[PDB]
Amino acid sequence: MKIFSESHKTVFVVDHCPYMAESCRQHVEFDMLIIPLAPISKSLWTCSVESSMEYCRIMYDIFPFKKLVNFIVSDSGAHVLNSWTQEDQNLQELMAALAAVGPPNPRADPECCSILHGLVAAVETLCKITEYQHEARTLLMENAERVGNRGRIICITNAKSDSHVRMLEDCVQETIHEHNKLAANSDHLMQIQKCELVLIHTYPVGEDSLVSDRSKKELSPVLTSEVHSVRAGRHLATKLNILVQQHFDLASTTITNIPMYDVELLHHKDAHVDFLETITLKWCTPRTNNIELHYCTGAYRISPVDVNSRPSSCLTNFLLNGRSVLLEQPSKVISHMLSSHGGEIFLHVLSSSRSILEDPPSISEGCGGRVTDYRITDFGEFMRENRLTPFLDPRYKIDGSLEVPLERAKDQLEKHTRYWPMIISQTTIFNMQAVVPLASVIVKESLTEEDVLNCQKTIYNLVDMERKNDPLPISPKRDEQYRIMWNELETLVRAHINNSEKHQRVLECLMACRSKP
Amino acid sequence: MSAQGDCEFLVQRARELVPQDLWAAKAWLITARSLYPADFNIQYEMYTIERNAERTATAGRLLYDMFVNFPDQPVVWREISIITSALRKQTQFLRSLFETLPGRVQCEMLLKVTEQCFNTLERSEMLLLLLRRFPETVVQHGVGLGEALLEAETIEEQESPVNCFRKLFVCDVLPLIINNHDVRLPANLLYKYLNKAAEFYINYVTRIVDPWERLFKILNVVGMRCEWRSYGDILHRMKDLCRYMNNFDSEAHAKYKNQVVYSTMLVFFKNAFQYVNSIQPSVPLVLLEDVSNVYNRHIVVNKAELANSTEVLESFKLARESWELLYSLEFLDKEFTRICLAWKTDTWLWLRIFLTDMIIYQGQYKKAIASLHHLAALQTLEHQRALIQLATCHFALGEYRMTCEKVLDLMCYMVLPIQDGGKSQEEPSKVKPKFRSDLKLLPCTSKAIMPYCLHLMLACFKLRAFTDNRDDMALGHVIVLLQQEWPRGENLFLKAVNKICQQGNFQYENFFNYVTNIDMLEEFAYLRTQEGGKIHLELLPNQGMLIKHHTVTRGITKGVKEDFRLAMERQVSRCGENLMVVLHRFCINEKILLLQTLT
């Protein structure tokens, strides 16, 4: 929907009790190439943290902006590991925070604490306002009430029984009610309108599931209990993967036929509206410079699911090297094309269906199409001169006036076209090579002293050519041609008189040097 | 010289001075009276002269003097007769003259005049005069006057009980005699008194200030005589006495039994007039069934058609209990039947009409048909009531044959609606009865009857055609009669189409003469296109012998296919019109349609 949806705020929490420290009975075979060591199994906490981190990596890869996420380990203390500002919602900082957290203590105090502190901290943290929420509130003045603060809390823990599940369900409902009541009176704390909750449970494989799966249940109009349950290891990673696909209406793609295996990409679902659970597209022969400006109806970022695997590494490296990739959907029709715009692989969506703007009227029969003397090359030069460039340094114009560079571009555009004849035969001053430096330099905002010297030299040899009676371009006697080009030049310089006092100076010099009858 | 000559001379001398000197004439008359106090002529002269002066006290004095002293003079009797006629500016002057006379002398003169009168009617007239002016004369002459009036009326051999004598007897004599607490009367003469009174009102109110209230007061009067408010609470009260009355009785029980018979009769008739005055005031109303669901009873009356609907319903319901009580008790049943036969005659019309609505309300129908025959015999708008109530009782529960016969006859004579009633006048209310389609009370106009008549025929044909098979003119008649009041016929018509889809042999031969509805025409041609049962539709006069009498040729199939679509386009062109007019036109034309209803 809008920017502030139920997926805007994701508040991860993680179990940190000593109960979540035993291995998951899924020992790996990281020994490939004597007598190898005993196979090693990741701990429950490690598996949960790893799967959460994969979720967040996909989060950040597809949605760099306008989607934040917290991290609240649930230990004897309640620690929030990163804040809501975009400068702190980063992957490496989260890595650092988890590293500083340290492995769970095996025999410190098992029954001293549970994950209720994590849930109460999450509902406490969720009620705050993001930078985007604050900006929207400030922008919409005196009516900043239609901005929902809906979020979502996710929990990974090893629950003892379903009675415990109902217990912390009642606890979270009570604490969200209390938080809403507290935030009603306060000002710098929003009231949660919808806090969807997920209470995933993990267990080592080979052990019975003490908690059965429970469907969606709304204990309150501000809470949606969706407690799941799955084993640790690969199952938990797959569960968080389908979670991240479901939460943000993502989609999958299965690019195959790669010259050298298949590769999978995750992106926004809107890329698949043309086809209308993984679509399978084929790499097609990439032509170097067949066409340059495609008709892309959507640019959706992608994120590999196996970013450290050989096929995905090869594909992403080739894309980042600069060349695009033209996929095709399953006689053939051209379809989605990959691209790499600075290091953010996009999945553009072309339009293979018939264009409703087919067989456009000929430009040779429209108004003005029967003229073959257009200054197309000169306008090409004009386009090249007035090209755009990004400005990362905002300067001040006069006094506290932070000029918008777009307005500067518009003003330069207006200045360059104060006298721009459309057809070659219309003008004579522009067609002559003598006044070309003067034409190029006079349109600038402020001519320098070297510019003054150049314009003086230009008028000098213009008068020299007048004296020599050289054949000017036809564009009706020689004197008539001279007087008309002088009139054109004086008209051009007159319109730029207000640009600077140097323009007035050169106009006065021209008037003094003019051979007026 | 005889004194008569002197008296005549004195009177003549007094008479001559009247135009010149009234006082001198009076002095001469006074002197003549002093000389001859026993002379009647002089006293009459003073009386006439003073009457020419319009005086009251002296006129009364002289009149009393001559009446007492000279009662044999015809002039005095003529003067008294003139005075009595005035009692029945000069009228007021003579009224004042009678007032000055003493009350006893006035009573004596009135009695003398009554004795001298020969005509019985006039004699009773000043008998009632003296009766009202002197209430002390009620005891001696009140009973005699009424008895003589009754005997004279009987002697006159009045074929009709309504006559002037009975009118005076009821209106004047009875209040005077029964308002007195001296005359003692038996417990039987009261029965004849109210019986005569009961005949007075019903003859007058069916065909004067307020007879109904006056006679109900008489019922109160005959109430205390036998012992010696709204009209609703009474029946419950007498009903409670019945719970004490029809129980143990020993010798007569004359008091309670007679009261619960006669009094119940009066309230029943009072309610009877109330009910038949609101409905059928002379637009009149008629009582029917509903049948409305073609797709302990209570009467459904529209408030718009009758502003006073609530009170009329209660009077009818309260009358029903009165008639039920008057027939429930075996002892009361026999006497009431005897009482009615005495003075019910041919039930007149108001009771006869009221009787019929009782039958249809109770549940019995055969007596309603028999009663309906009587109404027709006793008897324009009028024929609607007999026919429309005959139709619903014929419908009953399981006839379905005579009902369609009667309504078709009513259809033939009911054709006013050149414009019907507009387009839509307050489309039927969404009030849903608690699983009740019950007795309605509609006006005698086409606005309410027209949907009802087609409601009846649709109900009869719906049961006739939806069972068994072969979809004969039965089903075709349902389709035509389902045209009315769209879209309430949606489901039932779709059921008919489904049956038509099953058999595929529909044949009406008049489909394109009655069904001017686009929602039905459009649906029907859907069959002929995709897979429908090639409905026959011999919708062209003289087509059977065209197929039969002509040798099989291949140049006819194109025409057989084309005409159905062409005539369907023709029927489309009609559309519009007035739905009731087209439906009625089918009704009158297809009077042989009743052959199917015999099923």
Next chain:
Amino acid sequence: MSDIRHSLLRRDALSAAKEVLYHLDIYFSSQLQSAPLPIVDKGPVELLEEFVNSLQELQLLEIMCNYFQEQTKDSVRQIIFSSLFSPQGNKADDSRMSLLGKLVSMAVAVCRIPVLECAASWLQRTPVVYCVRLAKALVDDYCCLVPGSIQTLKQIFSASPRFCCQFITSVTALYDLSSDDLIPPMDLLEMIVTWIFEDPRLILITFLNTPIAANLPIGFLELTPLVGLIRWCVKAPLAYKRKKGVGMDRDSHLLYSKLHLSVLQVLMTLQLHLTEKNLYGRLGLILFDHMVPLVEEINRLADELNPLNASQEIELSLDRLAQALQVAMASGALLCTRDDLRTLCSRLPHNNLLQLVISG
């Protein structure tokens, strides 16, 4: 009484009269309290004589009216009125008569009911010679001096009916129609006609209210004006054609006929009035001694009036006289026999009604 006279000699005439009137009031009240019948002494008479201009006379009359209205006891009122106005056979009677006439005229003017009833009581016990003079003065004052003043005498009907009856009796006794100047005034004819016709009992209230214990003294006024009214009705036409205005004559004739009829009716009800009082056939309000002079003067007028020229007038007068006699003798008011009636009517002219009355 010497001390009272001495004390009052130092006061003015009006003041002296006022205090001597008060002294007579208290003295007569004490006398009546002591004895039922008080004897009138010469002391009060002389005190009134020597104690009781136009302004002074008017002030004295107003003081007398105020004194009479203030006191409420009737016996003292009547006794003091009599002592003030009863003739004593002296030269001061004329002044007393003038003062009484002025007082009665003022009382009629201002409706002084006690003064009116005092005058009626005194006039009842007064010789007719003074009564006729008082009536003459009242008639002048209310009929001839100030026109329209008879309406003031109109209102006396509802105030003192006994005074009305006495005034009628006095004017009938005075205006005996024996001369042209003695003919009753036309306004007075209307006046008495309205008085009698408004209330027929007016001329009989005196007879009813007076306890009859002895015969009236000779020379005094009659109990009822019936004799005077009968005489007026009888000889009134005779004087009218003796004086020979047609409209006034017709109005007077109608008035006299109506008055005669009302007198006959009054006699008719007086028959009853004598009936309940047990005076029927014993007491006669119309004395026999009064019909002889009226018959004689009727005969004199008839002889003087040339009956060949006034046959109708004589016939009408004789008819009226015969009717009056018949009603009087039939009602018991005239205790007489038919032989006596025949004897007195022998000299009267022939008249069929008169002969019938004589025969009976």
Next chain:
Amino acid sequence: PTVVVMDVSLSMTRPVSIEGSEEYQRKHLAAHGLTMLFEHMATNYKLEFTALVVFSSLWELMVPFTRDYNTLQEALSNMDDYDKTCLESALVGVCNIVQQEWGGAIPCQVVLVTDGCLGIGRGSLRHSLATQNQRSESNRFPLPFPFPSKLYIMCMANLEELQSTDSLECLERLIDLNNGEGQIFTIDGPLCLKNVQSMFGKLIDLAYTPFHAVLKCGHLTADVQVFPRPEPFVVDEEIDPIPKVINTDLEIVGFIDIADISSPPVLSRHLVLPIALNSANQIAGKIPNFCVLLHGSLKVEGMVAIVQLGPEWHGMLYSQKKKSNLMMSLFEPGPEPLPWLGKMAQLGPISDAKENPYGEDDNKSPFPLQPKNKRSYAQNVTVWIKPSGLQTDVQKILRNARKLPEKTQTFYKELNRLRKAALAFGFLDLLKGVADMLERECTLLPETAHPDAAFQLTHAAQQLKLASTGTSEYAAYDQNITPLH
């Protein structure tokens, strides 16, 4: 794309009682009205694709999408007279044909011509509307079109009063299923030809009025016509619900090389045809225009022309079968519709920059802009979901250990990454194991016996052994292992 779904059921052959003149069937009324619409759409909207599907019991498409209106104008007068009305089938067919021809993004107005009689049952509008809304299933109601459609129902059934007797709530509920975008059109009056003409004129003014605009590049101006008319866009429904349309005066702001723009995410490709304001070729053909010059220059040079339509909403005016034209695009409104171009408010002339960023030889290129924070596939992240990843990493670290002491720096960097991930994930057993296999490879050292190589591997093994205790000796994240000298 306009699909003219004209009802052809028997219900439109009902004659109307028009006063004065002869009786017309409602089919002829629709024919005249659609004739007016097609004449206007051919004379002033000639670039428009239209199709005329007729429906009754079953829907059939007589003429597919075409710009030749002399085909459709004759297709109106050669129609049949089928019976039965089934709107749901027509809507399904329209969805199918639009999806088959154009796709799922091009707008497609649907000018439906109903009669207000609806139907009687089964396939009727009433039955489907009352049931399929709560039923859906495979036969879901097609009224919620799967593309930016527009359902204009022209119920030519007298005034609102005539259709208020039987059924108009069904129709205005039918429009509602299209997200409320549409308009019920009713002919107010006694079915006179003037009234239906005004009705179709109202439709024309609402929908088929070309979007005129002025194309300004500084001072140079041109009068253009942008076809199709741009669809107003909405940022969201929470912070800015008011739709934003492009401004009438499209102002060119700058020109960007076609290589630097790559293939931007556009909203809708729009042609820009100059409009004058054999006469056209003999007068407007010779008058110098600006759009022709712009298109020619853009095609020859191979560049685009960034345009500023509305505040915080930009586009581009590029150039181009063999036919070519100046088709302009539209970006998503916002500060930076193109992430690899920077905030578009921060693009200025090359004069204001210190040097020429494009270069004197036109070799360097300021674009594309590198993102502030690098992604994961460009960086070196350490994923371990599948055991294959950890196996590959451990095989790489073991193989590079054999190459000692040649690639000491690479082996040290890889070991540093491995330990960084190890103490990040707290999977200490992995660190113990890699110490053990470093010892094992030390036992299997080759016969070359490089002195420095043995010292480096022994030092690395000792570092891993001490770090496997978990104490704060080298447990610091930044405590990268340094090879011995």
